[PDB]
Design an enzyme around this catalytic site. Sequence first.
Site, PDB file in Angstrom:
ATOM      1  N   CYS A   1     -30.131  -8.392  12.424  1.00 28.90           N
ATOM      2  CA  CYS A   1     -28.792  -7.876  12.629  1.00 28.90           C
ATOM      3  C   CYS A   1     -28.765  -6.643  13.539  1.00 28.90           C
ATOM      4  O   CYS A   1     -28.790  -6.771  14.764  1.00 28.90           O
ATOM      5  CB  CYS A   1     -28.145  -7.736  11.251  1.00 28.90           C
ATOM      6  SG  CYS A   1     -26.435  -7.261  11.465  1.00 28.90           S
TER       7      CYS A   1
ATOM      8  N   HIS B   1     -28.481 -12.429   8.572  1.00 28.84           N
ATOM      9  CA  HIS B   1     -29.480 -11.990   7.600  1.00 28.84           C
ATOM     10  C   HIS B   1     -30.230 -13.210   7.042  1.00 28.84           C
ATOM     11  O   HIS B   1     -29.734 -13.839   6.107  1.00 28.84           O
ATOM     12  CB  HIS B   1     -28.755 -11.241   6.483  1.00 28.84           C
ATOM     13  CG  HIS B   1     -28.368  -9.840   6.848  1.00 28.84           C
ATOM     14  ND1 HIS B   1     -29.189  -8.752   6.759  1.00 28.84           N
ATOM     15  CD2 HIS B   1     -27.165  -9.405   7.322  1.00 28.84           C
ATOM     16  CE1 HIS B   1     -28.498  -7.674   7.141  1.00 28.84           C
ATOM     17  NE2 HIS B   1     -27.249  -8.020   7.491  1.00 28.84           N
TER      18      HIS B   1
ATOM     19  N   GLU C   1     -32.875 -13.433   5.177  1.00 28.98           N
ATOM     20  CA  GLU C   1     -33.452 -13.168   3.860  1.00 28.98           C
ATOM     21  C   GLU C   1     -32.640 -13.708   2.679  1.00 28.98           C
ATOM     22  O   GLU C   1     -33.213 -14.038   1.646  1.00 28.98           O
ATOM     23  CB  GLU C   1     -33.686 -11.664   3.678  1.00 28.98           C
ATOM     24  CG  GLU C   1     -32.483 -10.725   3.872  1.00 28.98           C
ATOM     25  CD  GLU C   1     -32.301 -10.203   5.308  1.00 28.98           C
ATOM     26  OE1 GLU C   1     -32.832 -10.826   6.254  1.00 28.98           O
ATOM     27  OE2 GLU C   1     -31.627  -9.161   5.475  1.00 28.98           O
TER      28      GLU C   1
END
Lengths: 542, 542, 542
Positions: free
Chosen positions: B393, B513, B515
Amino acid sequence: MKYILVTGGVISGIGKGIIASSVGTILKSCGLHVTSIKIDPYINIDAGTFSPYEHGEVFVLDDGGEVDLDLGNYERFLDIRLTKDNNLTTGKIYQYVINKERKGDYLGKTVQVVPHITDAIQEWVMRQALIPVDEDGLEPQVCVIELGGTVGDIESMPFIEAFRQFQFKVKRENFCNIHVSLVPQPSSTGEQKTKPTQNSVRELRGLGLSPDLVVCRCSNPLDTSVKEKISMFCHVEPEQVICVHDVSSIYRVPLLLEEQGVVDYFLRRLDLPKMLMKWKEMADRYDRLLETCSIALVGKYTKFSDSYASVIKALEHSALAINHKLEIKYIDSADLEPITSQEEPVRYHEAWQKLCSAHGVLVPGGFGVRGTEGKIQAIAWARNQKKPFLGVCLGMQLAVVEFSRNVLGWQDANSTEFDPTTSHPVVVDMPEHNMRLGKRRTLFQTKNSVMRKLYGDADYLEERHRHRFEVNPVWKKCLEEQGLKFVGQDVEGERMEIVELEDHPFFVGVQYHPEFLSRPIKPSPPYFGLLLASVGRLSHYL
Amino acid sequence: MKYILVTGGVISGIGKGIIASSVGTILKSCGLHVTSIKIDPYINIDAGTFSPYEHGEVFVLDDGGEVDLDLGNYERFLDIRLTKDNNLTTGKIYQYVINKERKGDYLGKTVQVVPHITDAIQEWVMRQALIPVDEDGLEPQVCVIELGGTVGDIESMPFIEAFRQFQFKVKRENFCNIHVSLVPQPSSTGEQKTKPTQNSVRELRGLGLSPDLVVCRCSNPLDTSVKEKISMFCHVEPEQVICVHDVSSIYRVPLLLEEQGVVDYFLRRLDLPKMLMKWKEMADRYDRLLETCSIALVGKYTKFSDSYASVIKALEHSALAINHKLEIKYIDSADLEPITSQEEPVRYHEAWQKLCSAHGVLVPGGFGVRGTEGKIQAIAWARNQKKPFLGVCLGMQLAVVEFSRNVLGWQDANSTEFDPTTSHPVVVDMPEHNMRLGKRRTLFQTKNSVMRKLYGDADYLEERHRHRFEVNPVWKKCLEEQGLKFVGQDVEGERMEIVELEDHPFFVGVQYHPEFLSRPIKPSPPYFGLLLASVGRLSHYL
Amino acid sequence: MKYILVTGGVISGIGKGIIASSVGTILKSCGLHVTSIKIDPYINIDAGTFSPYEHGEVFVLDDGGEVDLDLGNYERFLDIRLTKDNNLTTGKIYQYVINKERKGDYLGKTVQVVPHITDAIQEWVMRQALIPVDEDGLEPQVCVIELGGTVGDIESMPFIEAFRQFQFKVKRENFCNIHVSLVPQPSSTGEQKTKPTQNSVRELRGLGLSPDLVVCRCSNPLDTSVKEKISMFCHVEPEQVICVHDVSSIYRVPLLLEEQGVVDYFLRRLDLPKMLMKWKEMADRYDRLLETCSIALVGKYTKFSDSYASVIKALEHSALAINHKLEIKYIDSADLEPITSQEEPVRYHEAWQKLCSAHGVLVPGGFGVRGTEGKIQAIAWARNQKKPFLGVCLGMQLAVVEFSRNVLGWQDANSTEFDPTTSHPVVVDMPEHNMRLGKRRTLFQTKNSVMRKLYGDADYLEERHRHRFEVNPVWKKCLEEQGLKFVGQDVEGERMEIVELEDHPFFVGVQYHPEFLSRPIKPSPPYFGLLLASVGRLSHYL
Ligand SMILES: Nc1ncnc2c1ncn2[C@@H]1O[C@H](COP(=O)(O)OP(=O)(O)NP(=O)(O)O)[C@@H](O)[C@H]1O
Ligand SMILES: Nc1ncnc2c1ncn2[C@@H]1O[C@H](COP(=O)(O)OP(=O)(O)NP(=O)(O)O)[C@@H](O)[C@H]1O
Ligand SMILES: Nc1ncnc2c1ncn2[C@@H]1O[C@H](COP(=O)(O)OP(=O)(O)NP(=O)(O)O)[C@@H](O)[C@H]1O
Ligand SMILES: O=c1ccn([C@@H]2O[C@H](COP(=O)(O)OP(=O)(O)OP(=O)(O)O)[C@@H](O)[C@H]2O)c(=O)[nH]1
Ligand SMILES: O=c1ccn([C@@H]2O[C@H](COP(=O)(O)OP(=O)(O)OP(=O)(O)O)[C@@H](O)[C@H]2O)c(=O)[nH]1
Ligand SMILES: O=c1ccn([C@@H]2O[C@H](COP(=O)(O)OP(=O)(O)OP(=O)(O)O)[C@@H](O)[C@H]2O)c(=O)[nH]1
Ligand SMILES: NC(=O)CC[C@H](N)C(=O)O
Ligand SMILES: NC(=O)CC[C@H](N)C(=O)O
Ligand SMILES: NC(=O)CC[C@H](N)C(=O)O
Ligand SMILES: [Mg+2]
Ligand SMILES: [Mg+2]
Ligand SMILES: [Mg+2]
């Protein structure tokens, strides 16, 4: 009078009795006379029934009061002489109010928790706070009350409600409250978590006490953010939150409270008018010390450290006086027993590896059969290997049994506590006729005992006892024609109080408990003798 | 429906969200469809305002809900797709009841905490427990509700009172309560102390819930005496007290609850009718792994581990997939800043020693200036030293800034988040016109990106976003005539979503993102790419 | 500022709002400027949704705030002009904190009940305590906060916790707490029982407030033994326990608190520097008065007295000004309906016996169909029998409907509130374009109305409204060519605000609610007109 109430927050066994003692040394250092009360919310009248696994060892006072080991922390720090009623219990309070009701002293009115139990708690605290406990007959000036347990235990609430009333029975300058609480720090996160202290202060506030200090107990020091969070939620000023982190020895706790500023607090909080230097020196010596001594502790109650609390302190006082690190090799005496070797041989060889690698041995006091044969095993080792020996109470009785079994050769010899069938009954049940319990005078019967020299060559000593059993005067001569000399005896000479063995480096039995009169700068002479002997210095000291 | 309420005892940050997730994997392993609700007693409507130091990182759901990181623990363990309203707050509940009162739906009666707030909590729990969160549109069968905070917090009491009513609104086979509590073990004593768990169960019982399991959280396993003491005082059967000691990884918690027997409990407690083997294998692999990889995490929020929680889990999933131990070198990005070298040079050289000894580097997402110049410093290191790089990001935006400053030579280049005076404004504020927030489709604009190959060579991917700022299409060509290829873009091609640099081992920016879509047996492709590249295996994988 | 918190003990509806008002008249009598706040722990934003059976009638403030009837008790006693935000609710507080969180004003920190809700309660109390509510723009000196409900209600605890903090945010001279509690006296025993007051003071103390006065509410005065028992157990000095027994009128409560000594308390408790004589005179006149007047109250909401609270006070102010006892014949208007005569004829004849034996009639305001036909029945009686009539709000609208049905002969005529099919729609829905709600100016359109003479012959009046419906200007002329004169109208003349009928002793409609501006020594002119007319004195007064 001034009163300081020390309350426990989240767990008991937090150090709240070392805070109460440390506050007592700070006020002692301001030249004040200090007394203490331990409140135990339990329903037992005294500690005399307890198995040593419950709340640690039974401490004995000069008057024969069997009390909690916190009365020993106060006596060690303040060097006072507390009485039976400095331990206050819900048993003692409800028994006192119940007898007062049966006698009619409540004038036909109904007796209640409020007022009548809570009034009796306040009467008792005032009554005991005025009794002289210093060496002079001087009235105390401050009374530290420690409330055992934690706040919001159902047993504790009569005392929290009594102190809620008390803080208005006396003017604000005369009453102050310290709250000792846990700040946990879990391994998974590493935040110090203040929530249980917030809930504990909120419970104490909800029971109507505002904590004048919050003493956070944590493994390592508070971050300033964590100390400020406590201040916000506990409604307490930033200088009024204390951390007592884990220290190297308890002698650093008065000094840690001095750094955290509590002396500059109590002097303005309680309208009050050098000695921390000796705690500073002792703590700095203890950190500097570098070569070891090791004592084997041949314990029955070896599951927990607190079960030998005054004994461990008497060994540490003696080791700090002889300038050595102390390594107490804790041995469960049942593992020295030859029956363990038949089925638990790794325990048997671990216990014997510990006992043989010790520089000297202590057989401490106790009651009942379990572990006795291992205590006899260790005394036989100490005689034959010539290792320095202290036998305390039970350890004197078992030295007389051991010398009977293996020097007189009376293989059936025992104490009649443990085997009432015994021929050659060398130790006998022998009560008082007023238990040889509390302080009594021992007279020396000789000029030239090493124990008479360690006790400074006065013709008497006054010491504290628990026991019910004694060395039999029918068999006394048969032991005295051989190597045991009963150097110390009672005023009428019916009871053997000290024994010394001939042609051994140091082998002494004492019938009393020397550990109760150990003080941080003045070890008890028998424990000093064992430490001196095990490092070889007892010959030089004489 | 079945409902499991997980309550916290003594502290928050205890592992109660891993217990709630582990119970969800046990029920998933019994073939049940599972959903979760996190109740946060705080008054915030969502996590979208939080500084990452409060309650850790902000997790993003498919629908753009900014929620607590516990919604990420449920998604990782259960492999579900939760919605905004699976996070329930006193903000969301009081706003819902307040709007319902202004609309007149309470029919001119007075609205109260009981019934009207506690009814809205029970409506909401039932409403959300029926929403499909698995990959199929199948209705859940069990809903795990975790109550955040601790019992007896003033914010928690509306929910404890709502579940006190709920346990009688539904038949006993349908509702069960787990209480997760601390059993501390202080260094000074070594007793595991159960008092705070007794008080916590007594508070939960006093608020009208009986705990069907007591889950004791302790550093090492309970002694049987301590487990039996909990049973006596907490009024719970010996097999109904669980210890969850500190484990080597969280994959051992479902298995620790299986050893402690909770599966054989829920099957008889909830009237219920192999997959723990994959948690067994993963946990046994994690313990066996022996050679390291190291990633530099170039964090802004580096004060606390929980501030990068899903990032650390995505790195651990990738390291377990490439069969390496992971050493995350946590670097505070402000220490890489050349201004730190002028006054804090030991921090500057520690940060650079960590960054240079790393095998690859991650620049994670964030907001606002502080630490940005250190993130640019680390991207410049990663280009020039050819070390593998993932920019997430903010790390993609700062890769476009870095390539502008040090490859195009535009020394004034910055994001207009950080400097709105900037000439060459290469990153620009660019809102939605329906924030590019929640799930969106990215299309690949090329056949031959290493990121297209890591994503399995589909022509699109669907991923989750936080950001407000984007790569400027006026400067896009000036970056594309040099080494940056914007390989991934939105459906209309106005926004750059993935960037890859030419002639570098692995240097990728992603605007989303990754994750949040990492799962224990399926790492997110960018984090797998960084791990593969830093151990050299990314060339072999292609 | 000075602050007085009035808390409720055992029940609500105890008189705690008359204690709060009486304390406000005592401080007004010490020459102080006084303001009040009513805290309602309910989640409603305002009283505007309430059915009049919940918490009694809806009071209207000058600003159009629909508030609790306690804001009317303060305005009657203190002669102040309160604002919308002098009613504080958990709805208004949680909405305020929730909007402040969505705007980001809590700076990305977590918002909680403590501090953030409890801080907003203290901000709001301070903010409102400084607003001028007297006739001059003078800042208040004392703010009486009444906490609605009882202590230990779950809704009340945010406010008790906010005042627990507040009593230390301000110096002790500035904050004081009164606790109003029940002392029941059961018929079976005749002991006054103090236990619920002890438990209520123990709850208030447990939430962290110490009551500075305990005001015991009992049917007849405390025995000195009962007052001393309260002192022992509530921990309060004997002169600091007040009894407020049942009095003949509420004007004796300020004087009962003066006898019990609260003036000599607040002057020493709050560091403070004749008018009780007018309450003394009024109370002594009310006890002396001996000949009756009787008004029929043609109520919809007749189940409870509190549903017409300001109306009953406006009738009592008018009856005390005309020196008569007042007998309000409460009639449920549904019993006047000719449908009741078919099935409940004993209710029908009881209602008509009451209505015919009344000396004058009041048709008070309301909403919705039920009871409307009985209100029309009573207006038709009042016209034909020439009995004095006041129609308030709905009663003016139903006078215009009645005159249409039975004077114009339009038998289908109705308000379009009740029948939207109606031809001749003489009353019409007509909202504001900024509900004609709060204070507005009415202008007189004539010199010679009896209402213009009762209002003291100013060309305007300013009065308070609830309504949504109005007299239709298409049908205005058809009513004006016959006996109705719309003597009072709005500033633009679009709305009819006062109506008077020709050749009737007193028959007036008002569109506003006159009862809200009634004050104990100054009745509202319409209610004074009805009282004067029904005793025949309205002709003599002119
Ligand atoms: N600051 C400290 N660091 C390390 N150890 C400590 C500290 N303070 C006290 N201790 C030891 O911690 C143990 C607990 O102290 P103690 O004062 O006996 O607990 P307590 O709460 O007072 N127990 P109770 O008598 O059951 O209410 C003792 O063995 C102390 O000697
Ligand atoms: N059994 C365990 N052993 C070691 N670490 C653990 C264990 N269980 C959980 N953890 C870790 O401990 C931390 C606390 O877990 P978490 O589940 O986030 O706490 P929580 O009580 O659920 N917090 P909150 O969301 O604030 O109410 C997390 O980082 C877990 O990954
Ligand atoms: N001393 C008294 N004797 C007789 N009646 C009284 C007395 N004091 C008050 N009242 C009346 O008793 C009723 C209750 O009074 P009020 O002050 O409205 O109760 P409250 O507790 O203040 N209610 P709430 O607003 O619901 O919290 C009112 O109608 C009063 O006018
Ligand atoms: O110092 C004292 C004295 C007495 N007591 C008395 O013993 C009771 C039990 O206090 P505990 O500290 O033993 O708590 P617990 O046994 O319930 O849980 P653990 O942390 O010990 O595992 C207390 O409620 C109090 O009555 C103490 O606790 N501490
Ligand atoms: O998971 C969650 C969610 C929300 N909350 C909300 O945050 C509030 C604070 O809960 P905390 O766990 O932060 O307690 P604390 O800050 O007061 O003390 P520490 O141990 O953290 O130092 C809780 O009362 C609850 O409203 C959590 O605590 N945990
Ligand atoms: O003056 C007020 C204002 C508001 N409230 C709000 O109304 C709630 C209910 O307060 P109540 O007095 O109505 O208690 P109750 O209905 O539960 O029992 P009864 O004695 O009335 O039969 C309170 O908890 C409070 O939130 C009042 O009670 N009184
Ligand atoms: N306290 C003791 O050790 C006493 C010793 C021996 N059991 C006795 O009771 O007499
Ligand atoms: N979450 C993020 O890192 C967002 C990146 C950038 N600050 C933005 O806000 O647009
Ligand atoms: N409060 C009232 O009586 C209002 C009168 C009429 N129902 C209206 O609502 O307009
Ligand atoms: Mg203690
Ligand atoms: Mg959690
Ligand atoms: Mg009231």
